[PDB]
Amino acid sequence: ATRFASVYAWNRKRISNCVADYSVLYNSASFSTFKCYGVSPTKLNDLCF
Amino acid sequence: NIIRGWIFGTTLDSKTQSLLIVNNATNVVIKVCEFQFCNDPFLGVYYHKNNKSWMESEFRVYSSANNCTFEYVSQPFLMDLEGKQGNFKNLREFVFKNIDGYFKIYSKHTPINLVRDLPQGFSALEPLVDLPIGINITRFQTLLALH
């Protein structure tokens, strides 16, 4: 956004009632490490969290 | 309508993870937050004569609040704000298990009818909702209301 919070006091946000996608993780910024634990990571558009 | 507030935490003086839950007259204010307390926790309402108006005054729960780790700010609505004497009418039973960190909340609410100490008969404690916290819990206290 412009600024997050530090590591001793991490920042929290609530997310609901919206449609998401990971295919748009390729345009606004290039991510260096993108790993998902415990679920098939390219199936995010296939479930309901 | 007597018990309104609650606090869930180990040290309950903003040194270990110490929740504040208050089912107040309008909003759900549930705050897993750093909270500093007085001696014996209470809530407060006051009632008039010319109109039958219950007015909300008292706040001696926390002196300080900056931090929050799990805040829960829900819909406002009207509370009937009773004090009505007679037969016992309301069980609002809140059975708490905490397996694998996530503190869990049940719901079971019934318009019962008797005079005194807890009625018998079966009443299920079926699952309602799970606040998915992961924190240090050793004790808890309750905040009553003062009518």
């Binding site: 530090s6 590591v7 001793y8 | 750093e34 900056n66 931090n67 960190g101 998915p132 916290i133 240090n136």
Partner: protein, 49 residues
Amino acid sequence: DSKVGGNYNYLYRLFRKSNLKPFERDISTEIYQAGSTPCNGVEGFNCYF
């Protein structure tokens, strides 16, 4: 977040007297009792931040 003089607005906790629980935050900045001589906010010996 990399400034020419440095970005000193973000902090990490160097040491903590106990360990953590998951999904938890503490910002208490009391003087870290490393050994003997309890601190009470003096930063003497065995008294770190």
